[PDB]
Amino acid sequence: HSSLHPSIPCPRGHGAQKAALVLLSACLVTLWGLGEEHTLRYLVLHLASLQLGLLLNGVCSLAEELRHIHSRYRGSYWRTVRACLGCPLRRGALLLLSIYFYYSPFTWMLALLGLSQALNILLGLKGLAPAEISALCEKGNFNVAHGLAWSYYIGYLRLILPELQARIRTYNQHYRGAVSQRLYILLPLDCGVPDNLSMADPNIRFLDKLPQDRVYSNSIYELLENGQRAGTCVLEYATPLQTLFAMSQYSQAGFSREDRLEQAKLFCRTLEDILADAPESQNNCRLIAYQEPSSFSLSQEVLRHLRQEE
Amino acid sequence: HSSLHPSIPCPRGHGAQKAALVLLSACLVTLWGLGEEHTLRYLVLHLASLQLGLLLNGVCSLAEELRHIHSRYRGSYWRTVRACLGCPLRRGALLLLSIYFYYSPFTWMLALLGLSQALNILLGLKGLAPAEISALCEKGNFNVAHGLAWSYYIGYLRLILPELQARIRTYNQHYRGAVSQRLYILLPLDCGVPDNLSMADPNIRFLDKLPQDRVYSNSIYELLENGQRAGTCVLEYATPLQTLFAMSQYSQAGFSREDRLEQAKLFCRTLEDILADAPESQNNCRLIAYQEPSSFSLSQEVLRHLRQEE
């Protein structure tokens, strides 16, 4: 229990599976009504016919995973097969057990299963309950990309992006000076965010403040390509990406450097979708989702996005 | 597509179900090998035997949902049955269609299904693929309770809670004055957060600052019970709860006042679990998860938690 308020739900315990012992016993107190007996033969010759269906679902869902294998699975085939089917060790042990039992019209008996499992997912019947949907979604304690993208747009973006173009031209009309039309939001996929950008590259080393209630001290950085001013624009890291970084450095929380490469591949995607919904903000700021491999320099890919403005 | 970087995965399209048309056609180009024919009879007399299993799973999972019906479903029985089974209109239409077809050993034929669906969830075979687990979890754009609880503990709690007891005794040794041992974090379940607490109740009306790099201007409030100082403690609202409030006032985002009563019933739970993991913080701050119904006064339930300290 330990609930601080009666409205707040306790986490879901094992009350679901302990009712299955009752359901298992209820069909097994029928045993004398069953015994007078090849009922163990028809159990595994039925549980094969479910386990082909989950196998045929993993085959059919593998066409979707194949499109995103490189982005999601770094170009590896074996991670895609593991993601498509799951843990087949508990399943395949029931496969090879069922081979012996029907050994003790099979070409038709596969033709019914592939026909059934096609219609079972084409008419949308492969769909859980809203309890089971909210069971596993409450199970993962780190589902932390939507809560960080939306806290960044509500918290920091929508409070600074309408008033940004005012401070751009004011710093431009004070200067002489050249200022980029929109703010640049860097998105390091490795989540390594330094507090200063002057050590991220020697090219970026610069600082300036801007005039404007809510004190937001944005910083303009100069991109010094081969010792020459190739572009003066405002750049700022993603503040939720330090949150994903500091969660991996919270070793009590089971947050790896691989979960940190999933949410930072998702928060960088959902933030584009949030900025695509707001009309003015999509033309107000540009996201740079740079990832450190090989060697590179991030001052080029800023200037990839900066030169294409004009 | 529209991907800003090749590592970032595009959202999952309909490539999964369009491969099922191939699987449906592959078992249906076997038709002359099937036709020479009651194969439509054995399709629905098989798809009943899957649809009893999903029905028997919803019956068995209903024992778990019943424990949390009041907290999750406000004490309503019909919302619990809808959450346990889902949308039975696409399923029950295949139920009553299958009644006519076997009409055109049933007591045993139910005894095998309840035996099978018990073992199918007791040996953990009711378990999806990590693609399908990450399919629906990417589908809900508002999974925003873990991303707000963890951004509050990493961002604001762990930066102010170690240095809190220093500022409590310093404001106490400057005074005369009585200060509570730990900071109080209010959690309004209706997400209605005013910028001042003096209008939340007339009892709370007070303000003070505290001495201390990171400027965090906490505010101490006096609880004036019947015009008398019943307790002087520091109280502050949940800043992620204004985020859940402002998302509902973003009408382009499909965020209702019912989703806002799920994440604010979850962020208030996960924040307790995060503070339970950190050893010093659990004895450093106390969460008050008050919910406005009926009439009430929140200055009492602060003093419920304040008087029990000593």
Numbering used by the authors:
A (entry chain B), B (entry chain A): 3 to 38, 41 to 108, 116 to 186, 191 to 227, 237 to 317, 321 to 337
Give the original sentences from the paper that presented this experimental model.
Stimulator of interferon gene (STING, also known as TMEM173, MITA, ERIS and MPYS) is an endoplasmic reticulum (ER) membrane protein that serves as a sensor of cyclic dinucleotides (CDNs) derived from infected bacteria or produced by the cyclic GMP-AMP synthase (cGAS). Upon binding with CDNs, STING translocates from the ER to the Golgi apparatus, wherein STING is polymerized to recruit and activate downstream TANK-binding kinase 1 (TBK1). The activation of TBK1 in turn activates the transcription factor IRF3 to induce the production of type 1 interferons (IFNs), leading to the spontaneous immune responses. Further structure-based functional analysis confirmed a new STING activation mode shared by the agonist and the SAVI-related mutation, in which the connector linking the LBD and the TMD senses the activation signal and controls the conformational changes of the LBD and the TMD for STING activation.
In fact, several gain-of-function mutants of STING have been identified in patients with STING-associated vasculopathy with onset in infancy (SAVI) or those with lupus-like syndromes. To test this possibility, we then resolved the cryo-EM structure of the SAVI-related mutant V147L at a resolution of 3.65 Å. Second, the revolution of the connector helices in the mutant was more obvious than that of the HB3089 bound STING, as indicated by the larger inter-Cα distance (10.3 Å) between residue 147 than that (8.8 Å) of the HB3089 bound STING. However, all the three domains of the SAVI-related mutant, including the LBD, the connector and the TMD, showed overall conformational change similar to that of the full-length STING bound with HB3089, implying a shared activation mode: the connector senses the activation signals and controls the conformational changes of the LBD and the TMD. First, the contraction of the LBD in the mutant was slightly smaller, as indicated by the larger inter-Cα distance (47.5 Å) between residues His185 as compared with that (44 Å) of HB3089 bound STING. Therefore, the conformational change of the connector helix from the SAVI-related mutant must be large enough to eliminate the clash between the two larger residues of leucine. The intrinsic force of the connector of the mutant, which is somewhat correlated with the steric hindrance of the connector residues, is enough to drive the structural changes of the LBD and the TMD through the revolution of the connector helices. The revolution of the connector helices has two effects: avoid the clash between the two residues of leucine on one hand, and release the intrinsic force of the connector on the other hand. Likewise, the 3.75 Å C1 structure obtained from the SAVI-related mutant V147L also exhibited the asymmetric vibration of the outer transmembrane helices that is similar to that of the HB3089-bound STING, substantiating that the asymmetric vibration should be the intrinsic feature of STING.
